[PDB]
Amino acid sequence: PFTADKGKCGLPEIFDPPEELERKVWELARLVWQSSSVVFHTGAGISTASGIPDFRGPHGVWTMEERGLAPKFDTTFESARPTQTHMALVQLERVGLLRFLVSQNVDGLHVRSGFPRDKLAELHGNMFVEECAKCKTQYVRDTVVGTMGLKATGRLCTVACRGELRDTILDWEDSLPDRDLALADEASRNADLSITLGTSLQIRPSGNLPLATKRRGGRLVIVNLQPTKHDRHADLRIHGYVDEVMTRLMKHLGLEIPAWDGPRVLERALPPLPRPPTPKLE
Numbered sequence: 320p321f322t323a324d325k326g327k328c329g330l331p332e333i334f335d336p337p338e339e340l341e342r343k344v345w346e347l348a349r350l351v352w353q354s355s356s357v358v359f360h361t362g363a364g365i366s367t368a369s370g371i372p373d374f375r376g377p378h379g380v381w382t383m384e385e386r387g388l389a390p391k392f393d394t395t396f397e398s399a400r401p402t403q404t405h406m407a408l409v410q411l412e413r414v415g416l417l418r419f420l421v422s423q424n425v426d427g428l429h430v431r432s433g434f435p436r437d438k439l440a441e442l443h444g445n446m447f448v449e450e451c452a453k454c455k456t457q458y459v460r461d462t463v464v465g466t467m468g469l470k471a472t473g474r475l476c477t478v479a480c481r482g483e484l485r486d487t488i489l490d491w492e493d494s495l496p497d498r499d500l501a502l503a504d505e506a507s508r509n510a511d512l513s514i515t516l517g518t519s520l521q522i523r524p525s526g527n528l529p530l531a532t533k534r535r536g537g538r539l540v541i542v543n544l545q546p547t548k549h550d551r552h553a554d555l556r557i558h559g560y561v562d563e564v565m566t567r568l569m570k571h572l573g574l575e576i577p578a579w580d581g582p583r584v585l586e587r588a589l590p591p592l593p594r595p596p597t598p599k600l601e
């Protein structure tokens with residue numbers, strides 16, 4: 320825990336020049352249009368533009384720790400707003416262009432954005448979510464559950480049970496929630512496109528799930544400012560801010576990024592909305 324391997328921290332950032340970046344976002348649009356089953360994989364890099372530091376970026380939590388400095392938050396977890404990237408992912412789900420969403424983020428922003436929980440794997444937990452040790456019933460709270468490491472929060476279950484409520488935040492030694500990992504793995508294996516956004520892909524098994532898409536000739540896109548463990552395996556690497564990438568992608572797909580209503584929980588994916596017709600590609 321003190322000696323936990325925190326991987327490669329503070330690698331230099333890469334920036335694709337504008338013409339190369341424009342061309343790669345067009346090729347990402349082409350891959351989205353051609354794919355039957357698209358799975359997105361998100362890490363800490365998609366929440367940096369809302370004031371939450373990443374882990375291994377230049378000013379990441381682990382990077383700063385390694386250099387004897389402190390990470391900086393420009394928000395509380397409760398005051399954090401979903402990024403343009405978060406809200407793009409909401410819309411891509413609503414119009415049927417995203418099949419499943421796998422996140423290593425504990426910041427609760429996917430849930431609070433209104434993204435449907437039945438199409439989301441939270442592989443490392445959710446700091447707003449406590450779970451009954453007895454009945455396994457989950458509670459999505461409006462404030463952060465004040466513990467980490469799957470500890471008693473002090474609250475009891477209110478299901479018609481008085482079980483011990485615990486946080487869902489994995490410690491270094493804790494294996495992943497079985498249901499979330501099973502769904503994430505099935506979604507990744509059956510995908511013909513996996514797109515990774517703001518993750519360095521260094522954590523097993525989370526960072527390995529996008530490689531499962533490469534089985535049976537699936538395509539892998541990696542969007543990230545730094546190198547990632549799997550750059551070698553990517554059909555397309557995009558070195559740019561994820562909000563710039565996703566806003567230009569939505570524009571190519573003819574989709575608007577929806578307004579955020581404030582924190583809202585949606586358990587189940589609503590029926591698919593109309594989407595624009597597909598361009599002639601070939």
Ligand SMILES: Nc1ncnc2c1ncn2[C@@H]1O[C@H](COP(=O)(O)OP(=O)(O)OC[C@H]2O[C@H](O)[C@H](O)[C@@H]2O)[C@@H](O)[C@H]1O
Nearest residue numbers: 362363364367373374375423517518519543544545560561
């Ligand atoms: N706006 C941005 N646009 C694009 N890339 C970005 C942006 N901001 C940051 N990045 C990149 O985003 C990447 C974020 O990589 P890491 O910091 O390793 O986060 P993880 O989610 O993969 O960490 C996995 C677990 O490890 C921890 O112990 C926790 O348990 C985590 O759940 C970097 O490479 C940045 O270059």
Ligand SMILES: NS(=O)(=O)c1cccc(S(=O)(=O)N2CCN(Cc3ccc(-c4ccccc4F)s3)CC2)c1
Nearest residue numbers: 362363366371372373423424425426489490491522
């Ligand atoms: N990604 S994010 O936007 O939700 C984010 C970004 C920065 C800081 C936070 S945090 O303040 O809520 N916090 C900082 C300390 N972490 C300790 C860990 C304990 C165990 C860990 C672990 C579990 C399983 C596999 C591998 C692992 F490394 S990581 C927990 C999150 C959240």
Ligand SMILES: [Cl-]
Nearest residue numbers: 395396397463
């Ligand atoms: Cl907070």
Ligand SMILES: [Cl-]
Nearest residue numbers: 413589590592
């Ligand atoms: Cl909808």
Ligand SMILES: [Cl-]
Nearest residue numbers: 467468489490
């Ligand atoms: Cl912890």
Ligand SMILES: [Zn+2]
Nearest residue numbers: 451454476480
């Ligand atoms: Zn209970």
